[PDB]
Design a protein around this nucleic acid. Structure first.
Ligand SMILES: [Mg+2]
Ligand SMILES: [Zn+2]
Ligand SMILES: [Zn+2]
Ligand SMILES: [Zn+2]
Lengths: 99, 199, 575, 95, 123, 145, 570, 83
RNA sequence: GCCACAGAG
DNA sequence: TGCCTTCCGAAAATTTTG
DNA sequence: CAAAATTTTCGGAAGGCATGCTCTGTGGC
């Protein structure tokens, strides 16, 4: 939250984000804006691409493609806001390893 | 009865197992993920046999554990169609007889469809009756070595239901899953049974 | 045995695919069909009414209600969508320019493209080069549409295709109409369509002569019902030259017309906070969705038993305006409704929106803001954190075989003496335990080797230090912390030049990283010793400042001569 | 570098950058989002602003390479062990 | 106030219920029973479908073990399927690049013939 | 996980038993190890064995099921006594006859007895051999290489 | 609603996943997947979705096919006349073959048993002992294999009498024009053919002309038009029984060329059947037999259902549209085979028309009686027959097909929405444009039912709502609304609706046969087929009879849907 | 495979500052989860200072995998890089 | 939680 | 208070028909 | 040549963004 009257924190604005990019700090930016700010565990079905819940995709009626991932909660909020606007932010997933 | 399966997988070596031998660590996590578990449409894996090819261990940005792509060979309990096998009779019921191979693959279910003709279950001593003629009289008793041929193998995947259905089941049970891997055997020739029947 | 092998492969996002949702996708993902304008039933305990714009099936807003779709509290439900069916289709306030473009690009009598096959083949070959980008693709679409307009007559029928445009081009209720002027290109030839039009008007003017004055403005309007039925008949092979890929089932023009409005989860429209009232309030989205449900109920009930067409079209226009202002509340004013709101488009743009308020930059934990005081006796890589600030700021240190005794002592010292610990978390546990509601002696002896303890910010820990106007890259730097008890952040004055800091009530910020990787990142790349040169021109920017250069001048003056005692005193003073 | 003086504005960033999310973070967010949903344009997440939005490691700076740990085993030790039953077998009596 | 202007033909009770039926309730005049000539027509359709599905132009849907047993002796697959190249082909009708998979050199043999006077319905 | 090929080779039961006994001995899982190290004396070296209950249980059950007497007389399997060169000699003597590869596989998995066990394990015994070859191979398999 | 349904119930029970696909795509894909396999279905699906495609583009788009599978699928589709191709050369000289989709093969797959039934009816051979089975089997073999040569089909039979009957029956089938010689014409698109002919006739004109560009264009267009009319009708006239007397003074179909089903003549027959069904409504029952004989005498020489010149993209010029209409009226009036008198129709009435007391003028197949029947046909409201000269008659296909369209559409909308729908549709089709009050005065029925029925008609595009504003800025709050009938939008909408219903029926049938594959496969093979009683269990009998009964109902309803969908192609 | 042969390499052998930062970060994260240290420690407990003391005398068992733009990758041992 | 001013660098 | 794009009649300029 | 089509060029209106970056307070709905 905002303000010292609600035990709030400090803003890390767009200019500070650009300044951290200017050093080549990737891990620090990931820590600041995802790990310790709004981390959230989500389940994504990598055949359609929409969010589910509790290891279940509510479109395909199956748990055959559910994958646990970590995103900011603001990302999930944006995706649901877009979905209510009849925009579908379908996610596509690749392997993190070349395998 | 035992076959070799070439299985490729992504194995996770934690940082706190660097001090051990590398092959030992791969073996340990492979036994963690694979041993005494069934690989679907493959069979049941007991342990791993040898590692064939390993690659350089990559690292995920955020955690220090090393991930390695290993293509290993694993022993699998996958008998073919026609391999005679011996088990120990453990249970019976009006739908068939349950036999287990003394601690390994407890689920073998001999039905009455391919079993010997003329058999009938008596619900008074919990036994089947197999008369060869008027003179012979014997019962399908328990705790003896029985020989049979695996006639059918059943491959069914288990799916978690919708969490509403799972919650309903949890609320109902507080006030028997299908077996994922099963071999169905049969006896249709001379000597297909207990040794004492065929001295 | 009977346990099935569990396979897990870590994944990343490869790329987003932006599309629209067909009717099947909007209904299939839904859980409840919102068909009642009542939010709370007054008869029983102010509960959320079933089949309503607020409903347990779409989530919860308090901490004492369950979802009954996933059975979680407010912190454990990601949201569950609803769906709403409209009595008559309405247009989309966002894709309206897209709808105008596509009806420009098709015939209005048989729903086919206006190009001949030769130009169509040439343009299709033009789109599918391997090197196409966004600019070239939109340019080719612009040229295709400009070729569509130039056509006189369709090629599968002899119909006339005129000019498609808006009605008033303003902020009124007319802003969501489409006019298809069909005889501005009719010319002076025979034109049988003109004959049909004049015969129709020769028939209708016999009983309403007063309408003869308005024959010039009566143009063939395209309501969403006829627009939708013109969309359904468009050949799927024609979607490519209108920008829509026709491979996926959602890639159809019919998708861009509102037939199913997805009711957003209550997690993205929670109950607005109340100060002293015994009741509660609801966000503008909930109220306006209830407004939509009521208007659609009115339209369907009016279609069941006949009403004059003027009233039905008026309420249908009100539904269109209410949908449009639900999605976007800048193009249309609330003045036209019978009788601004925080819509979706006003939550995605602006300084305090989402894309610039909570995604591209967001408030972080583990920060602290304090006024600034000088301290020259501190090394130029060391900032001074007060005693009462380092007792709340903490670093999560994981116990290893090298720091067991140190962390045991930190845990015993407690959360009230500075070299102490404030939280402990174990491997077998999922919730951290406070170190003040405990014994602080049993936890030392039973410390697992894989535990994590949030120790106090002691000497040597890496802190990010920042000043709010971040004009260039030197504004955020990394310092080693030193603990000194005077309630103010203190940094060496040679470091204050990049911060543009003046000890005049100035306020600077202190973040603390959590993972060791980010700590090493900050200390090795962001460090003040490693960054003494601005990349503006390579000049040194962390050097002597005012009153340090004066001391240098006074020492190095020609008329200075120090004896041996003063020399050795200065030499021992500077080190 | 696109071939014409595009400039630094919304109308230049539209003509330079193919990405959707990065243009969405700048100006006219809803218009770009709706146009991207209409034309159905793929958005490969490689841009830095997209990476920060979706919460994953960017590919500039300290994300340009993957640090790799080498397994210290040779190819001679990973020779497969004997398959005695298959090795001693032959097919000459009947096949 | 908003919900206060109802038209001439409605009251306060009709509104407040937004349940548009998703199931249909309006049938066509084609829905009736089956007559004798229509039965023969349906037999003709189903016979043609069953003929073509096994015919030389089907394409795939996109024990069974290789072990050496002795049940395979004097045992043979109950039918020999027809491939893509086992039919007469007019060389002029087909395009040029399609000559690879089809067999110009291979002999053109198959010409089936089948029709039944007895219905293939078990009812 | 991605399965590359299902059945790379076949395993005799002797190979499985030998590999599992080697694994048991290397990790000191045998009853002799617990009798000598764990039981009958106090522990001073603190050399704990391998700690994984599931693999230990499955290996113990498999070795117990393989090593014991099989359905041919109501002592041991016979496999737990015969060695590598014994297997070579036995299965080379098997190679002289017309039985196929998988047939040799069940011949080396279990061991057929005189009474109709060869009839069950071999397909169509009468269509294959006369009496003398059957009785001599029964003698050589009952002789344990 | 006794119990509310969740969206899961809507997705499972109600067909909602199927409402988001185009009727054309859904119909073609379900038909191809029903008859051929899934690979042909996917190839046709991408061909319809993305339009013209090449083999490399097909490999890139469809996932899971190599080039060999794609080429096998394309050969299978090309044999069944289901994909058209065109070889195009570029400037560099790299020739590439583009593939399309053609309607004819799909419609053949959708018209199979109806084609068999119609050719059985049009055989008209007296005292057939084995000939009917032979015609049925030769037609089925022709349709299933796409195209076949007569010689290759003759080699499958060795007996002499049956081979002679093959020769006679193929001669008979080709005589009326049901089996026509195929060529590269049926596999190239009409648009590409017209473009090539026009460009060759335009580039061939001598250069440096001091003559006008527009009229040079029209002159090249007219020469291309007459060559187009020569080339399209080439197989239609006669191309397969031109040979006379190979041996022993007999007429045999050419034993050198392959025959293929002629779909457009079958469309002529179905339009004739639709006209007969319309004539069975206003006048007569024996008079219907008379008009049926009149159509069946002139069924072969009838004009096309759609003019191939109309699909050539030459409708932008209004003068060419009027010229097409006038040429249609030209050909339909004075074709040298469509004109007949009473005596020509005398020799075709079978022995069931009585006509002794068929008419009463007061308030043996003779010329006067058949003339009276032709006259009462000529006096009907719809132009069933027209007289270029008193005594000779011609059927006006140019001015009767719109009438048949209107009548069929009005009866459909009446049977599905009620007689109020008929009343309002006819009231707003007679009057060109009305407000509400003109309806309320002229159509004598209550106000609210007018508003309800007319509101229900807008949803299916029977009436278009025309706004007339009374304000400086347009608004429906104060405006007057008129109601019109646009025939084209309505006809197209109901055509696509019927296509969707047909495809929904076939999808449900395919799902039923796929879900119950075990029993159908057990009963499928020949040793049990016809003697299913001995081995099957009591429940299996009920299951098999349920499956077969549902299949028969599905295909019967498909035929009944075709009987309404064929009209809207014309 | 896709990797350039080790005999010839067309990238700069001087270790970039970002490579040093990532090596120290990964080593500190690995030591923070009970990994062995090959360098003798004089008593230092915090993982990151031990990581610096480890790299100061080149006993880090990692290898840096450099991505060229096309997709081919080269391998560089931390022993081989010079500082 | 929404608006309005007041300020600090 | 400045700046820029897109859209659309309106009138001037061109090719195009008779 | 002058009547008409057809394409181009020049305005007024409507939209958008800027109006920094954050931080702390009251006062009242
Ligand atoms: Mg100041
Ligand atoms: Zn899914
Ligand atoms: Zn929930
Ligand atoms: Zn048109």
């Amino acid at each position: 939250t905002e303000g010292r009257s609600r035990d709030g924190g400090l803003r890390l604005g767009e200019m500070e984000r650009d300044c951290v990019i200017a050093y080549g700090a990737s891990q620090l930016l990931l820590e600041r804006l995802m790990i310790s700010s709004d981390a959230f565990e989500v389940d994504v079905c990598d055949k359609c691409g929409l969010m589910g819940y509790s290891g279940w995709c509510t479109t395909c009626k199956s748990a055959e493609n559910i994958i646990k991932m970590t995103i900011p909660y603001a990302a999930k909020l944006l995706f649901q806001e877009l979905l209510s606007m009849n925009i579908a932010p379908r996610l596509r997933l690749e392997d993190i390893f070349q395998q | 009865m035992f076959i070799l399966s070439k299985i490729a997988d992504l194995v996770r070596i934690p940082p706190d197992q660097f001090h051990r031998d590398t092959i030992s660590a791969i073996t340990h996590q492979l036994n963690n993920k694979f041993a005494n578990k069934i690989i679907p449409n493959v069979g049941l894996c007991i342990t791993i046999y040898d590692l064939l090819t390993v690659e350089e261990g990559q690292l995920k940005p955020g955690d220090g554990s090393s991930y390695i792509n290993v293509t290993f060979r694993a022993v699998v309990f996958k008998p073919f169609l026609g391999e005679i096998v011996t088990g120990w009779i453990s249970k019976c019921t009006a739908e068939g007889i349950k036999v287990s191979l003394l601690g390994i693959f407890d689920d073998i279910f001999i039905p009455q469809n391919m079993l010997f003709e003329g058999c009938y279950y008596t619900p008074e001593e919990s036994a089947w009756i197999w008369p060869m003629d008027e003179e012979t009289k014997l019962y399908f008793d328990v705790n003896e070595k029985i020989r049979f041929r695996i006639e059918r193998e059943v491959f069914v995947d288990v799916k978690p239901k919708s969490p509403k259905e799972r919650e309903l089941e949890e609320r109902a049970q507080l006030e028997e899953k299908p077996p994922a891997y099963a071999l169905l055997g049969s006896c249709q020739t001379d000597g297909m049974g207990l040794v004492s029947w065929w001295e | 045995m009977k346990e099935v092998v569990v396979s897990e492969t870590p994944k990343r996002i490869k790329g987003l695919e932006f599309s629209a949702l067909s009717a099947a996708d909007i209904v299939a993902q839904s859980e409840v069909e919102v068909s009642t304008r009542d939010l709370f039933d007054l008869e029983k305990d102010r509960a959320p009414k079933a089949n309503g714009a607020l409903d347990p099936k779409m989530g919860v807003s308090s901490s004492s209600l369950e979802c009954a779709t996933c059975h979680g509290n407010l912190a454990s439900c990601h949201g569950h969508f609803g769906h709403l069916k409209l009595a008559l289709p309405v247009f989309h306030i966002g894709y309206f320019k897209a709808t105008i473009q596509i009806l420009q690009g098709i015939c209005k009598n048989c729903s086919a493209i206006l190009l001949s096959e030769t130009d169509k083949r040439q343009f299709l070959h033009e789109l599918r080069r391997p090197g196409v980008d966004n600019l070239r693709r939109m340019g080719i679409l612009k040229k295709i549409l400009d070729q569509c307009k130039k056509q006189r007559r369709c090629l599968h029928c002899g119909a006339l295709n005129g000019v498609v445009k808006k009605a008033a081009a303003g902020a009124g209720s007319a802003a969501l109409k489409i006019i298809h002027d069909t005889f501005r290109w009719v010319g002076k030839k025979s034109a049988p369509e003109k004959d049909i039009w004049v015969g129709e008007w020769k028939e209708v003017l016999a009983h309403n002569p007063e309408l003869e004055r308005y024959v010039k403005r009566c143009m063939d309007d395209l309501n969403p019902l006829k627009t939708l039925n013109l969309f359904k008949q468009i050949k799927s092979a024609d979607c490519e030259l209108l920008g829509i890929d026709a491979t996926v089932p959602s890639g159809r023009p019919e998708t861009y017309i509102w037939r199913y409005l997805p009711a957003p989860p209550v997690c993205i429209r929670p109950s607005v906070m109340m100060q002293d009232s015994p009741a509660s309030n609801e966000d503008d989205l909930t109220v306006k969705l209830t407004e939509i449900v009521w208007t659609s109920s009115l339209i369907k009930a009016g279609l069941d038993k006949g009403i004059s067409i003027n009233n039905m079209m008026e309420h249908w226009d009100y539904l269109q305006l209410t949908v449009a202002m639900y999605i976007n509340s800048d193009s249309v004013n609330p003045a036209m409704l019978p009788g601004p709101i925080r819509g979706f488009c006003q939550r995605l743009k602006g300084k305090q929106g989402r894309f610039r308020g909570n995604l591209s930059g967001k408030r972080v934990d583990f920060s602290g803001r304090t006024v600034i005081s000088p301290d020259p006796n501190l090394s130029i890589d060391e900032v001074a954190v007060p005693d009462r600030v380092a007792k709340v700021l903490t670093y999560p240190e994981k116990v290893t075989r090298y720091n067991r005794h140190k962390l045991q002592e930190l845990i015993v010292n407690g959360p009230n003496v500075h070299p102490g610990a404030n939280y402990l978390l174990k491997r077998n546990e999922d919730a951290r335990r406070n170190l003040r509601y405990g014994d602080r002696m049993k936890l030392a002896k039973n410390l697992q080797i894989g535990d994590v303890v949030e120790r106090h910010l002691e000497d040597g820990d890496v802190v990010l230090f920042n000043r709010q106007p971040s004009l260039h890259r030197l504004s955020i730097l990394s310092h080693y912390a030193k603990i000194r008890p005077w309630r103010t952040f203190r940094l060496n004055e040679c470091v204050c030049t990049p911060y543009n800091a003046d000890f005049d009530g100035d306020e600077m910020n202190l973040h603390v990283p959590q993972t060791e990787e980010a700590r090493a990142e900050a200390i090795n790349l962001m460090g003040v010793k490693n960054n003494l040169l601005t990349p503006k021109s390579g000049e040194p920017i962390i050097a002597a400042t005012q009153d340090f250069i004066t001391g240098s001048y006074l020492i190095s003056h020609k008329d200075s001569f120090y004896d041996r005692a003063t020399l050795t005193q200065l030499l021992s003073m500077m080190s | 570098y696109k071939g014409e003086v595009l400039g630094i504005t919304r109308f230049g960033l539209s003509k330079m950058r193919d990405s959707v999310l990065q243009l969405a973070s700048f100006e006219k967010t809803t218009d770009h989002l709706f146009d991207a949903a209409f034309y159905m344009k793929k958005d490969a997440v490689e841009g830095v602003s997209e990476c920060i939005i979706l919460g994953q490691t960017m590919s500039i700076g300290t994300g340009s390479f993957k640090v790799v740990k080498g397994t210290n085993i040779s190819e001679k030790d990973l020779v497969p062990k004997r398959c005695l039953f298959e090795s001693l077998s032959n097919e000459a009596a009947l096949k | 106030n908003y919900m206060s202007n109802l038209p001439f033909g409605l009251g306060y009770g009709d509104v407040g219920k937004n349940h548009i039926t998703e199931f249909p309730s309006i049938p066509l005049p084609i829905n009736g029973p089956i007559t004798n000539k229509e039965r023969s027509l349906a037999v003709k359709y189903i016979n043609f479908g069953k003929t073509v599905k096994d015919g030389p132009f089907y394409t795939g849907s996109m024990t069974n073990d290789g072990i050496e047993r002795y049940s395979d002796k004097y045992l043979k697959k109950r039918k020999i399927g027809i491939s893509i190249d086992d039919h007469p082909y007019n060389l002029n009708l087909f395009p040029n690049e399609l000559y690879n998979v089809m067999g110009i050199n291979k002999k053109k043999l198959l010409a089936i013939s089948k029709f039944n006077n007895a219905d293939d319905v078990f009812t | 996980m991605k399965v590359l090929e299902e059945r790379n080779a076949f395993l005799s039961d002797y190979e499985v038993l030998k590999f599992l006994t080697d694994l048991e001995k290397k990790h000191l899982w045998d009853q002799k190890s617990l009798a000598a190290l764990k039981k009958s004396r106090s522990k001073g070296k603190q050399n704990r064995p391998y700690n994984h209950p599931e693999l230990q249980g499955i290996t113990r059950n498999v070795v117990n099921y393989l090593s014991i007497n099989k359905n041919f007389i109501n002592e041991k399997s016979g496999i737990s006594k015969m060695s590598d060169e014994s297997f070579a000699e036995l299965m080379t003597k098997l190679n002289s006859f017309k039985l196929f590869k998988a047939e040799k596989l069940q011949i080396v998995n279990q061991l057929p007895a005189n009474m109709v066990h060869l009839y069950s394990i071999v397909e169509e015994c009468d269509a294959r051999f006369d009496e003398k070859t059957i009785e001599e191979m029964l003698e050589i398999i009952s002789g344990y290489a | 609603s006794e119990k509310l349904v969740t969206p899961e119930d809507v997705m499972t029970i109600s067909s909602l996943e199927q409402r988001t696909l185009n009727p054309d795509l859904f119909l073609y894909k379900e038909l191809v997947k029903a008859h051929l396999g899934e690979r042909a279905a996917s190839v046709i699906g991408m061909l319809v979705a993305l339009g013209r495609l090449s083999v490399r583009e097909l490999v890139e788009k469809i996932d899971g096919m190599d080039v060999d599978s794609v080429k096998t699928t394309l050969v299978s589709l090309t044999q069944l006349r289901c994909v058209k191709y065109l070889q195009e050369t570029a400037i560099s000289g790299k020739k590439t073959t583009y593939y399309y989709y053609n309607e004819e093969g799909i419609h053949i797959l959708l018209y199979s048993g109806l084609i068999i039934d119609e050719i059985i009816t049009q055989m008209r051979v007296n005292d057939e002992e084995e000939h009917k089975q032979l015609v049925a089997e030769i037609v089925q073999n022709v349709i299933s294999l796409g195209s076949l040569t007569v010689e290759d089909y003759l080699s499958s039979v060795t007996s002499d009498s049956m081979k002679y009957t093959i020769s006679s029956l193929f001669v008979q089938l080709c005589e009326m024009g049901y089996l026509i010689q195929i060529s590269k014409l049926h596999y190239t698109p009409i648009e590409d053919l017209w473009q090539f002919l026009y460009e060759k006739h335009y580039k061939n004109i001598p250069r440096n002309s001091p003559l006008s560009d527009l009229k040079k264009r029209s002159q090249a267009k007219m020469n291309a038009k007459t060559d187009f009319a020569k080339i399209i009708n080439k197989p239609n006239e006669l191309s397969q029984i031109l040979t006379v007397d190979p041996k022993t003074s007999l007429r045999i179909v050419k034993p050198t060329v392959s025959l293929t089903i002629n779909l457009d003549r079958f469309m002529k027959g179905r339009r004739s059947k639709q006209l007969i069904n319309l004539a069975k409504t206003r006048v007569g029952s024996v008079t219907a037999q008379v008009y049926k004989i009149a159509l069946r005498l002139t069924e072969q020489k009838s004009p096309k259902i759609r003019d191939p010149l109309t699909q050539t993209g030459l409708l932008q010029d209004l003068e060419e549209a009027k010229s097409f209409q006038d040429e249609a009226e030209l050909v339909e009036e004075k074709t040298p085979g469509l004109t007949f008198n009473a005596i020509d129709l005398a020799r075709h009435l079978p022995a069931e028309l009585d006509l002794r007391g068929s008419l009463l003028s007061r308030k043996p197949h003779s010329a006067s009686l058949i003339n009276s029947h032709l006259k009462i046909l000529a006096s009907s409201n719809f132009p069933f027959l027209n007289e270029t000269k008193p005594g000779v008659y011609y059927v006006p296909y140019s001015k009767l097909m719109p009438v048949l369209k209107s009548s069929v559409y009005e009866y459909v909308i009446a049977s599905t929405l009620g007689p109020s729908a008929m009343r309002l549709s006819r009231c707003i089709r007679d009057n060109k444009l009305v407000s509400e009050k003109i309806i309320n005065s002229t159509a004598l029925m209550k106000e609210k039912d007018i508003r309800s029925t007319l509101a229900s008609l807008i949803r299916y595009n029977s009436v278009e709502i025309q706004e007339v504003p009374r304000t400086a800025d347009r608004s429906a709050s104060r405006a007057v609304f008129l109601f019109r009938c646009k025939e084209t939008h309505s006809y197209n909408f109901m055509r696509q609706n019927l296509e969707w219903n047909m495809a929904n029926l076939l999808f449900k049938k395919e799902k039923l046969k796929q879900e119950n594959s075990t029993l159908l496969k057990k009963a499928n093979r020949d040793d049990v087929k016809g003697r299913e009683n001995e081995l099957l269990l009591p429940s299996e009998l009920n299951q098999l009879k349920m499956v077969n009964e549902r299949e028969l109902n599905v295909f019967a309803r498909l035929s009944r849907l075709l009987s309404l969908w064929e009209v809207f192609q014309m | 495979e896709k990797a350039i042969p080790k005999d010839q390499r067309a990238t700069t052998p001087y270790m970039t500052k970002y490579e040093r930062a990532r090596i120290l970060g990964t080593r500190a994260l690995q030591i923070s989860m009970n990994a062995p240290v090959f360098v003798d420690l004089e008593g230092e407990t915090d993982p990151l200072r031990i990581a610096m003391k480890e790299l100061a005398e080149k006993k880090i068992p990692l290898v840096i995998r450099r991505y060229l733009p096309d997709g081919s990758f080269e391998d560089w041992s931390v022993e081989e890089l010079i500082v």
